[PDB]
């Protein structure tokens, strides 16, 4: 089976990944330019982290040198149009104007885990695989790239997570073909979550899933619809529910 | 133990009927018109053709029969190569092909191939280890043919080849081997002695064709193959015993040695004109695409001129002892005159793209990178423009202003991101931003 | 029984490498490659790299291949760095005393401490296609088509779009198999789908096909090209050349256009109740 994780996360003005010219990385989608965070940054951000340090694990999930890793991380994409900005700075002497680039955007992240590959890499152990899945979920929920963080303390937390158990891999990037336009009676994160909701309201009409928002701040579906099997307001409870569905293990 | 280039199969070809095959030199000359040379790397596709051209020159010199167009290759060429069967041998105690006497400088056989890491090179994109994986006989032959054309400096105490830094290589293309041989047949009055003959001598000044085309800057031995059941690390063919180690010594190039390559492109000062591609965008460079416009002013004014056909360009970027990239291209040329100013402007376009990139969004600042978003859209526009390369070179229906249109949509898309406001000032700024285009600079 | 199977390749980013990538510069092809599609099918079925070369790649090599470019993406470049803050592996090893032993014999004596590392940072640039869609039709035996469709219904391993960082945006088995005589009819059968009501739509769709030999002989035409993408092995990689032709289909006469069939903009709910609706008066009277 395959476990798919979708995350929606808003970040404060920062520069978490830049190119050789110092500008934030970008991509092209929906006929517009969007902000991008590289996959090999989110990986090595989740990896090599102190929090994640909780049959050798950390290699079965992410391989090294025919290990056949069981974790797949995609490229983070923005739900709106990119808005790069330039900051003009000078250096004092206490005894020449330079420019830097920064941006702020809301990102959609996609992760996939193959359960059978994880079990086979662990040589039949099944409790260790569940512990690794829980640890990876906790680490991915509470980790950010260590870019220009000393000048841009961007330590925001995700505002919505969806865990799915589909038969085939598929990403919901097509829910963001039209860039999000902010209206007075809503905000950016709410509109992004509504756009996501109006992509699983379809498809089924024309599997199960667990939805998590902090203290039920943003509920999936702008109605009393059953598009989500369970709505959970705690991260540990979400981990426990996923652990139970994996085959009934205790966190 | 015993291996001959005339009998054993080492030449990878594809027949015009659609069947890939690996045949020998004798059969390659026999058919020569129902097949094309098939190689993934342009380097081998170039050196094998150069070797075939040199062999044809030798056969014509010693037989006095030229290859007629739209016909099989001359028959009398085949017996002559049969007589000189002792000069094409890869092993044994005697005369060796493109080799010399043994030495004590032992090196694994991986420095003959540029793309496979060796010694201090980092093995990330190709997992290899010295004296563990080797090459087959065909790959050894294909790597011995790269010495005269694609040899770079070795750092301290080791020089380059006869052509110094490997420059661009421009020739003519055809749909069959005989056609390609017949479109680049121009011989000289002085031929010299080829390297595959008896011991080559620098002797006096002047070089000729056969000696220059087969210059050997290094001495190599190719010890022996060791039994095993591994696979070649260059082609991947599941095979038998391979070679693992050899001996390499450096041959300096004497001063003087007046030589002009039939295919190389030179600058105004006589230096080699090489590709200018890099993996990064520094203060004096902007990464766009293959630089197909560089060896055009020199070629269409010094050697080759205007001629209807297909121009094949091979470019190999390098920096000291480090390899960067290789690419190739084919341009359809009709041969309709030339304009000096326009060709010179076309030959200098990287500077124009850099100048376009370096312009800041507003103001003038020293040491400013300048609008990095334009560099993200430049490669796509360059790729779109490169389709009409033949018409842009000769100015038939394509012009600089015609190619300037491809940037409009991308700049319009970028302007929305750069000025995300719904005011009059933002719209005026977007209108000003849309009208950016490179400017031709001739010097 | 159906003789052809369809694959849809769509995503935010995808890459199909070309033969002109032998260094840190990795470029991509304009259309999906035969080797990539065959590797995707092998991964879906569940054959490893060392087993595909034995009686699984030759079987799939006989299938005819054709790709229809619905919408082409934009070429984008990514700056990649490797090994910053760590040490990279080198290939340098001590020369042996005698040439008698090399390869497997010397590999048995390899130790973890014998390897050598250096502190450095590898730089590279990699090419991707942004916002591109492709339709692939594979034609051949009906039993093989049925097996491939069944495997594609539920994949054994994760499937991507040439690189593991490129997950699909639409299901790969969206279009069921059918029966057709030629590749052109099969490619014209599947319609063309829009994403929102007002968007540019290509007037002409390019198509890249394999070249059928026809009768015995029939040398390849003058517009045929050579692509080095016929798989023979996956470990180590080995590719063979093939002949490829290009054609086109004009929309509106041979390829149809589908409707939106969905809602893009979310928008909030509905306030502003009506004071003239009969239901409002009924409930107001009841409340009174
Ligand atoms: Mg080989």
- In whole angstroms, give the CA distance from residue C262 to residue A143: 35
Which residue's entry shows tokens 């293959």? B290
C-beta separation of B352 from B440 below 8 A: yes
C-beta separation of A198 from A175 below 8 A: yes
Contact at CB, B375 and A21, closer than 8 angstroms: yes
Contact at CB, C269 and A222, closer than 8 angstroms: yes
Using the Cα atoms of residue A111, residue A117, residue A121 and residue A127 in order, give the sign of their dihedral. Answer: positive
B47: Cβ–Cβ under 8 A, 6 or more apart, which residues?
A: B142, B145, B146, B148, B149, B150
User: Which chains contact A through at least 3 pairs of Cβ atoms less than 8 Å apart?
Assistant: B, C
How many angstroms is it from B236 CA to the middle of ligand 1?
7
- The minimum CA-CA distance between B129 and chain A, rounded to whole Å, is 14
- The minimum CA-CA distance between C26 and chain A, rounded to whole Å, is 16
SS3 of chain B: CCCECCCCCCEEEEECCCCEEEECHHHHHHHCCCEEECCCCHHHHHHHHHHHHHHHHHHHHHHCCCCCCCCCCCCCHHHHHHHCCCCCECCCCCCCCCCCCCCCCEEECCCCCCCCCCCCCECCCCCCCCCCCCECHHHHHHHHCCCCCCCCCCCCCCCCECCECCCCEEEECCCCHHHHHHCCCCCCCCCCCCCCCCCCCCCCCCCCCHHHHCCCCEEECCCCEECCCCECCCCCCECCCEECEEEEEECCCCCCCCCCCCCECECCCCCECCCCCCCCCCCCCCCCCCCCCHHHCCHHHHCCCCCCEEEEEEEEEEECCEEEEEEEEEEEECCCCCCHHHHHHHHCCHHHHHHHHHCCCCCCCCCCCCCHHHHHHHHHHHHHHHHHHHHHHHCCCCCHHHHHHHHHHHHHHHHHHHCCCCCHHHHHHHHHHHCCCCCCCCC
Contact at CB, C236 and B231, closer than 8 angstroms: yes
Is-cis flag, bond preceding C236, omega within 30?
A: yes
Helix (H, G, I), strand (E, B) or coil at A207: coil
A226: Cβ–Cβ under 8 A, 6 or more apart, which residues?
A: none
How many angstroms is it from A49 CA to the middle of ligand 1?
43
Characterize B213-243 residue by residue with b for buried, 16 or more Cβ atoms within 10 angstroms of its Cβ, and e for exposed: bbbbbbbbbbbebbebebbbbbbbeebebbb
Q: Which residues pair with B316 in a beta bridge?
A: B326
Contact at CB, B413 and A31, closer than 8 angstroms: yes
C-beta separation of A101 from A35 below 8 A: no
Instruction: Look at residues A2, B125, B435, B282 and name the one whose alpha carbon lies nearest to residue C168.
Output: A2
Contact at CB, C82 and B124, closer than 8 angstroms: yes
Angle between helices B350-358 and B372-385 (to 10 degrees): 150
- The minimum CA-CA distance between C82 and chain A, rounded to whole Å, is 9
CB atoms within 10 A of CB B384: 16
Which residue's entry shows tokens 């991380």? A73
- The minimum CA-CA distance between A106 and chain B, rounded to whole Å, is 15
Chain B residues 372-401 with CB within 8 Å of chain A = 372-373, 375-376
The phi, psi pair for C143, rounded to 5°, reads -65, -45
Interface of C with A (CB under 8 A): 11-13, 49, 73-74, 76, 78-80, 130-131, 153-155, 157-160, 164-173, 195-196, 199, 261-269
- In whole angstroms, give the CA distance from residue C210 to residue B377: 32
At C66, which helix (H) or strand (E)? strand C64-71
- Is there a binding annotation on residue B232? yes
Instruction: Look at residues A78, B380, B320 and name the one whose alpha carbon lies nearest to residue C127.
Output: B380
Mutate to test the interface with A, among B359, B361, B372 (most CBs of A within 10 A): B372
Q: Which residues pair with B258 in a beta bridge?
A: none
Contact at CB, A26 and B376, closer than 8 angstroms: yes
**DSSP label at residue A14:** B
Listed resolution, Å: 2.5
Q: Which residues pair with C250 in a beta bridge?
A: C204
- In whole angstroms, give the CA distance from residue A190 to residue C49: 45
Interface of A with C (CB under 8 A): 2, 19-20, 25, 27-31, 38-40, 66, 72-75, 77, 110, 112, 114, 117, 167-171, 173-174, 177-178, 183, 185-186, 191, 194-195, 197-198, 202, 206, 222-223
Which residues of B fall within a CB distance of 8 Å from C103?
A: 131-134, 226, 228, 230, 242, 244
| Distances from the Cα of A110 to the Cα of A3, A39, A132, C168, C175, angstroms | 11, 10, 18, 11, 25
**DSSP label at residue A216:** G
Q: Pseudo-torsion of CA C175, C180, C183, C184, nearest 10°?
A: -90
Q: Is B233 an interface residue toward C (CB < 8 Å)?
A: yes
Q: Which residues pair with A112 in a beta bridge?
A: A4, A72
Contact at CB, A21 and B372, closer than 8 angstroms: yes
Which residues of B fall within a CB distance of 8 Å from A23?
A: 369, 372-373
Enter the tokens of residue C109: 């004596």
- In whole angstroms, give the CA distance from residue B226 to residue A162: 57
Helix (H, G, I), strand (E, B) or coil at A108: strand
CB atoms within 10 A of CB B138: 21
Residue of chain C whose Cα is closest to the Cα of B106:
C95
- Is there a binding annotation on residue B136? no
Residue of chain A whose Cα is closest to the Cα of C199:
A31
Using the Cα atoms of residue B37, residue B38, residue B43 and residue B44 in order, give the sign of their dihedral. Answer: negative
Enter the tokens of residue A25: 């990385």
Characterize B44-63 residue by residue with b for buried, 16 or more Cβ atoms within 10 angstroms of its Cβ, and e for exposed: bbbbbbbbbbbbbbbbbeee
What sections of chain A are H helices per DSSP? Answer: 39-42, 115-121, 127-141, 188-200, 235-245
Residue of chain B whose Cα is closest to the Cα of C210:
B18
Q: Pseudo-torsion of CA B105, B109, B113, B118, nearest 10°?
A: -80
Indicate the residue of A31, A167, A169 with minimum beta-carbon distance to C159: A169
- Is there a binding annotation on residue B123? no
C-beta separation of C41 from C65 below 8 A: no
Residue of chain C whose Cα is closest to the Cα of B329:
C20
Structure determination method = cryo-EM
Enter the tokens of residue B271: 């230096």
Enter the tokens of residue C95: 């020369």
Which residues of B fall within a CB distance of 8 Å from C23?
A: 115, 125, 323-326
Instruction: Look at residues B392, B269, B249 and name the one whose alpha carbon lies nearest to residue B334.
Output: B392
Characterize B7-24 residue by residue with b for buried, 16 or more Cβ atoms within 10 angstroms of its Cβ, and e for exposed: ebebbbbbbbebebeebb
- In whole angstroms, give the CA distance from residue A145 to residue A192: 22
Q: How many CA atoms lie within 13 A of A88 on its CB side?
A: 8
CB atoms within 10 A of CB C32: 26
Residue of chain B whose Cα is closest to the Cα of A34:
B417
User: DSSP characters for A148-182?
Assistant: STTTS------SEEEEE--SS----GGGGSSPP--
C-beta separation of B218 from B151 below 8 A: yes
- The angle subtended at Cα A22 by Cα A18 and Cα A28, nearest 5°, is 55
B182: Cβ–Cβ under 8 A, 6 or more apart, which residues?
A: B67, B69, B174
- In whole angstroms, give the CA distance from residue A247 to residue A244: 6
- The minimum CA-CA distance between B289 and chain A, rounded to whole Å, is 17
- The angle subtended at Cα B292 by Cα B291 and Cα B293, nearest 5°, is 95
Enter the tokens of residue C24: 């840190």
Mutate to test the interface with C, among B91, B113, B122 (most CBs of C within 10 A): B122
C-beta separation of A160 from A7 below 8 A: yes
Helix (H, G, I), strand (E, B) or coil at A3: strand
Residue of chain B whose Cα is closest to the Cα of A83:
B417
- In whole angstroms, give the CA distance from residue B211 to residue B198: 12
- In whole angstroms, give the CA distance from residue A157 to residue B276: 45
- In whole angstroms, give the CA distance from residue A162 to residue A209: 7
A-to-C residue pairs, Cβ atoms closer than 8 angstroms: 102
Contact at CB, C91 and B383, closer than 8 angstroms: no
For chain C, the residues before each gap (C–N > 2.5 Å) are none
Q: How far is CA C6 from the centre of its chain?
A: 12
- In whole angstroms, give the CA distance from residue C286 to residue A35: 55
Contact at CB, B373 and A23, closer than 8 angstroms: yes
Which residues of C fall within a CB distance of 8 Å from A168?
A: 153-155, 171-173
- The minimum CA-CA distance between A98 and chain B, rounded to whole Å, is 8
CB atoms within 10 A of CB B292: 24
Enter the tokens of residue B418: 């750069």
């Amino acid at each position: 089976m395959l476990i798919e994780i979708h995350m929606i996360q808003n970040h404060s003005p920062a520069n978490l990944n830049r190119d050789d010219l110092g500008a934030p990385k970008t991509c092209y989608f929906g006929g517009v330019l969007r902000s991008r965070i590289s996959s090999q940054c989110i990986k090595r951000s989740i990896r090599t982290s102190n929090d994640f340090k909780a049959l050798a694990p950390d290699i079965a999930l992410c391989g090294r040198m025919t290990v056949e890793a069981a974790l797949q991380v995609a490229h983070a994409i923005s739900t709106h149009i990119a808005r790069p900005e330039i900051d003009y700075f000078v250096a004092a002497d206490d005894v020449h104007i330079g420019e830097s680039m920064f941006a702020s955007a809301c990102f959609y992240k996609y992760f996939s885990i193959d359960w059978e590959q994880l079990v086979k890499n662990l040589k039949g152990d099944t409790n260790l695989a569940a512990h690794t899945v829980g640890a990876f979920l906790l680490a991915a929920a509470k980790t950010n790239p260590s870019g220009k963080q000393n000048s841009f303390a961007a330590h925001n937390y995700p505002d919505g997570i969806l865990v799915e158990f589909k038969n085939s891999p598929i990403s919901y990037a097509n829910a963001f073909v039209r860039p999000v336009s902010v209206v007075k009676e809503s905000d950016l994160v709410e509109q992004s979550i509504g756009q996501l909701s109006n992509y699983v309201n379809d498809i089924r009409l024309g599997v199960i899933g667990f939805w998590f928002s902090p203290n039920n701040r943003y509920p999936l579906g702008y109605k009393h619809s059953k598009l989500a099997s369970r709505n959970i307001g705690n991260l540990n409870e979400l981990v426990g529910a996923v652990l139970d569905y994996i085959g009934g293990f205790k966190w | 133990v015993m291996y001959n280039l005339l009998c054993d199969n080492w030449v990878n070809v594809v027949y015009l009927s659609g069947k890939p095959d690996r045949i020998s030199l004798v059969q390659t000359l026999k058919d020569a018109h129902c097949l094309q040379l098939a190689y993934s790397n342009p380097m081998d596709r170039f050196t094998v053709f150069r070797f075939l051209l040199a062999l044809g020159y030798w056969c014509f010199a010693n037989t006095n029969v030229e290859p007629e167009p739209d016909k099989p290759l001359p028959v009398s060429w085949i017996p002559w190569l049969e007589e000189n069967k002792e000069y094409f041998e890869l092993f044994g105690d005697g005369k060796r092909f493109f080799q010399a006497d043994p030495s004590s400088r032992i090196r694994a056989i991986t420095d003959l191939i540029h793309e496979i890491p060796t010694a201090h090179n980092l093995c990330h994109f190709k997992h290899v280890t010295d004296y563990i994986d080797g090459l087959c006989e065909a790959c050894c032959i294909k790597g011995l043919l790269r010495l005269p054309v694609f040899t770079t400096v070795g750092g301290r105490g080791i020089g380059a080849g006869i052509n110094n830094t490997p420059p661009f290589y421009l020739l003519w293309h055809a749909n069959d081997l005989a056609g390609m041989l017949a479109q680049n047949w121009q011989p000289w009055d002085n031929m010299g002695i080829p390297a595959w003959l008896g011991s080559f001598q620098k002797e006096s000044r002047e070089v000729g064709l056969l000696a220059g085309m087969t210059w050997l800057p290094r001495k190599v031995y190719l010890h022996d193959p060791v039994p095993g059941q591994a696979a070649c690390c260059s082609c991947g063919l599941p095979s038998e015993a391979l070679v693992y180690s050899c001996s390499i010594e450096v041959e300096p190039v004497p001063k003087g040695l007046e030589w002009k390559d039939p295919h190389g492109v030179y600058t105004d000062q006589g230096k080699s004109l090489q590709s200018k591609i890099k993996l990064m965008s520094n203060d004096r460079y902007t990464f766009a695409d293959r630089d197909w416009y560089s060896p055009l002013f020199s070629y269409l004014h010094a050697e080759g001129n205007s001629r209807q056909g297909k121009l094949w360009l091979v470019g190999f970027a390098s920096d000291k002892a480090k390899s960067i990239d290789i690419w190739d291209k084919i341009i359809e040329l009709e041969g309709t005159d030339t304009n000096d100013e326009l060709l010179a402007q076309l030959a200098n376009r990287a500077t124009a793209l850099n100048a376009m990139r370096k312009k800041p969004l507003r103001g003038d600042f020293k040491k400013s990178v300048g609008t990095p978003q334009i560099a993200d859209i430049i490669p796509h526009a360059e790729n779109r423009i490169a389709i009409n390369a033949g018409k842009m070179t000769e100015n038939r229906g394509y012009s600089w202003q015609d190619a300037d249109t491809e940037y409009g949509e991308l700049l319009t898309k970028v302007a929305y991101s750069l000025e995300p406001a719904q005011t009059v000032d933002a719209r005026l700024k977007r209108g000003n931003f849309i009208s950016r285009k490179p400017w031709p600079i001739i010097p | 029984p159906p003789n052809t199977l369809f694959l849809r390749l769509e995503g935010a980013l995808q890459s199909w490498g070309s033969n002109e990538a032998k260094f840190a510069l990795r470029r991509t092809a304009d259309a999906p490659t035969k080797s990539g599609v065959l590797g995707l099918l092998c991964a879906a079925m569940g054959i490893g790299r060392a087993e595909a070369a034995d009686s699984w790649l030759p079987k799939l090599a006989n299938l005819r291949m054709g790709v229809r470019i619905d919408r082409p993406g934009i070429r984008w470049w990514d700056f990649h760095t490797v090994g910053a803050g760590q040490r990279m592996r080198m290939a340098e090893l001590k020369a042996p005393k005698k040439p008698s032993m090399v390869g497997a014999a010397l590999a048995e004596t390899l130790t973890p401490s014998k390897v050598k590392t250096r502190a450095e940072t590898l730089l590279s640039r990699r090419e991707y296609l942004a916002d591109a869609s492709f339709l692939v039709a594979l034609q051949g035996e009906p039993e093989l088509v049925a097996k491939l469709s069944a495997a594609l219904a539920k994949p054994v391993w994760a499937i991507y779009l040439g690189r593991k960082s490129c997950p699909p945006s639409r299901p790969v088995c969206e279009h069921p198999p059918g029966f057709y005589n030629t590749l052109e009819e099969a490619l014209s059968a599947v319609p063309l789908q829009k994403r929102w009501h007002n968007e540019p739509l290509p007037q002409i769709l390019p198509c890249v096909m394999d070249w059928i030999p026809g009768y015995d002989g029939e040398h390849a035409p003058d517009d045929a090209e050579i692509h080095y993408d016929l798989p023979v092995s996956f470990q180590p990689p080995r590719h063979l050349p093939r002949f490829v032709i290009r054609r086109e289909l004009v929309v509106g006469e041979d390829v149809q256009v589908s409707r939106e069939t969905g809602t893009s903009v979310w928008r909030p709910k509905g306030t502003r109740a009506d004071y003239n609706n009969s239901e409002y008066k009924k409930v107001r009277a009841e409340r009174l």
